[PDB]
C-alpha cells in the first residue's frame, strides 16, 4: 500500500477509492513536492511497473509542471524552478532515463520532458537535454522505442515552448526529426512521431527552408510521407503541407506544379474524412495566403512600387478541379448531427466561400452547372448541396454581376424554404438571407 498502490487507485472504478487516492496525491504535491516528484519519476522510470502505474506516475509529474491556464502554468513553472537544483537534477535524470523503456503508447515520459523543459530551457537550466534528445534519435543503434519516444518529447517541446527559444538549435533538432521521417525508417510509429514533431518545428526552420538544398529534402521527405500506408502518418504529413503552405508560400513553385496539386487533390477525394479534411484545409490556406497577397499587392499599387512578395494564383489555376470536388463534398451532409461538427462538408463550404472571394468572378460559371443540375433533386442532400453552393458563391463575384443570377434563382430559392427537408429549409433560409443583405 505504497505509491504504486495509490497511483493505480487513480483509475479504480470505485468512486470512494478514487477521491481517496486523489486527495493523497494532492497533499503530497503540497506538503512534500520535491520528494513526491523524485518518487513519481522513479516509478515512471522503472520498466518493472504496470502501465497503469507508470502512466499515472507520468500524469502526476506532468500535472505539477503545466496547465492550460497561462496563469496557473506560470505558477507551476516557477514553483519548479524554486525547487532544489539537485532534486530537479534527479527528476530530470529519471524522466530522461525512461525514454526507450516503455512498451505502451504514447510515451508518458515525453510529456514530462516537455514539461520541465518548457520551464527550464528559457532559462538555460537544462542545456544538455536537446543534445541528448538528438543523440538518442540519431544513434545508429538506438532502438525502435528510443527514437519513437524521444521524437515525441522533441515534438512536445517544439509544440509548447516559444519557437523563439530553439532557432539556435533548429539544425540539430531538424536533423533528428528528418531522420525518423526518411523512408529508410522501418517503423511507421517512429515515422509518425517524427512527422508530428516536424509540424511544430516549422516555426523556426525558416533558415533551412531558405537553403534550396535543404528545402528540397524536407519537401521530399514530407511528400514521401503523404504516401505512407499508415493513415496516421499520412494525415500528419498532409498537415505539414498545410502549414508549409502558409509559412513558405514563396517557395512552393518547384513542388506545387508536379507534386502538391496531385497529392492534395487526391487527399480531398479520400474516403477517410480526416484525410479529405487536410486536402481541403490546404487549398483554403492557399486562398487565404493569396487573398492577403492581393492586398499587399494593391497596397503597393498606391505606393507606386512592387510588393515584397507576389501571388502565383494557384487557387485560380485549380478552380477547374477544385470546384467539382468541393460541390461534390457538400453532398456528404450530416442528416443527424452537430451543426458544430467539422466534417468535410463543413470544410468544403467554408473553402468554397474562400475560393469565391478569391477567384471572384470566375467562380460562378464553374458552380452554376452543379446548382442547376441539382437544385431540383430527389435526394435532399444534393438539393441542399445545390442551395448551399449557391449561397457560397454569393460573396466574391461583382455585386452587379450577381444580381441577374439572383433573378432566376430567387424563384426556386423560395420554394425550397418550404422544402420538406429541415436541412434544405435551413440552408435556403441562410442563402436568401445573404441575398437580401448584400445586393440590396
Amino acid at each position: 500500500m505504497e505509491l504504486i498502490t495509490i497511483l493505480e487507485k487513480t483509475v479504480s472504478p470505485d468512486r470512494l477509492e478514487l477521491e481517496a487516492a486523489q486527495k493523497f496525491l494532492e497533499r503530497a504535491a503540497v506538503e512534500n513536492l520535491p520528494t513526491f516528484l523524485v518518487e513519481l519519476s522513479r516509478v515512471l522510470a522503472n520498466p518493472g511497473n504496470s502501465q497503469v502505474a507508470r502512466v499515472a506516475a507520468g500524469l502526476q509529474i506532468k500535472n505539477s509542471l503545466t496547465s492550460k491556464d497561462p496563469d496557473i502554468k506560470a505558477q507551476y513553472q516557477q514553483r519548479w524552478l524554486a525547487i532544489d537544483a539537485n532534486a530537479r537534477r534527479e527528476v530530470k535524470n529519471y524522466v530522461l532515463h525512461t525514454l526507450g523503456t516503455e512498451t505502451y503508447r504514447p510515451s508518458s515520459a515525453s510529456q514530462c520532458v516537455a514539461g520541465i523543459a518548457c520551464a527550464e530551457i528559457p532559462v538555460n537550466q537544462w542545456p544538455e537535454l536537446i543534445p541528448q534528445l538528438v543523440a538518442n534519435v540519431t544513434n545508429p543503434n538506438s532502438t525502435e522505442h528510443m527514437k519513437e519516444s524521444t521524437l515525441e518529447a522533441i515534438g512536445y517541446i517544439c509544440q509548447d515552448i516559444d519557437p523563439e527559444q530553439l532557432q539556435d538549435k533548429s539544425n540539430e533538432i531538424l536533423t533528428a526529426i528528418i531522420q525518423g521521417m526518411r523512408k529508410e525508417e522501418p517503423s511507421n510509429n517512429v515515422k509518425l512521431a517524427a512527422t508530428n514533431a516536424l509540424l511544430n518545428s516549422l516555426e523556426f526552420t525558416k533558415a533551412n527552408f531558405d537553403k534550396e538544398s535543404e528545402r528540397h529534402f524536407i519537401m521530399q521527405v514530407v511528400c514521401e510521407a503523404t504516401q505512407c500506408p499508415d493513415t496516421r502518418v499520412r494525415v500528419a504529413a498532409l498537415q505539414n503541407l498545410v502549414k508549409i503552405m502558409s509559412l513558405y508560400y514563396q517557395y512552393m513553385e518547384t513542388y506545387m506544379g508536379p507534386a502538391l496539386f496531385a497529392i492534395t487533390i487526391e487527399a480531398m477525394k479520400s474516403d477517410i474524412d480526416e484525410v479529405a479534411l487536410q486536402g481541403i484545409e490546404f487549398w483554403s490556406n492557399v486562398c487565404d495566403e493569396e487573398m492577403d497577397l492581393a492586398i499587399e499587392a494593391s497596397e503597393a499599387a498606391e505606393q507606386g512600387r512592387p510588393p515584397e512578395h507576389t501571388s502565383k494564383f494557384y487557387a485560380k489555376g485549380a478552380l477547374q478541379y477544385l470546384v467539382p470536388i468541393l460541390t461534390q463534398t457538400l453532398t456528404k451532409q450530416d442528416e443527424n448531427d452537430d451543426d458544430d461538427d467539422w466534417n468535410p462538408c463543413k470544410a468544403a463550404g467554408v473553402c468554397l466561400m474562400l475560393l469565391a472571394t478569391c477567384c471572384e468572378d470566375d467562380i460562378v460559371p464553374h458552380v452554376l452547372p452543379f446548382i442547376k443540375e441539382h437544385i431540383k433533386n430527389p435526394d435532399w442532400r444534393y438539393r441542399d448541396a445545390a442551395v448551399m453552393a449557391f449561397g457560397c458563391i454569393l460573396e466574391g463575384p461583382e455585386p452587379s454581376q450577381l444580381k441577374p443570377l439572383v433573378i432566376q434563382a430567387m424563384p426556386t430559392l423560395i420554394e425550397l424554404m418550404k422544402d420538406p427537408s429541415v436541412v434544405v429549409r435551413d440552408t435556403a433560409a441562410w442563402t436568401v438571407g445573404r441575398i437580401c443583405e448584400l445586393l440590396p
Binding site: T35, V38, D84, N86, A87, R89
Partner: peptide
C-alpha cells in the same frame, strides 16, 4: 540528489 534529493537527500543529503
Amino acid at each position: 540528489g534529493l537527500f543529503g
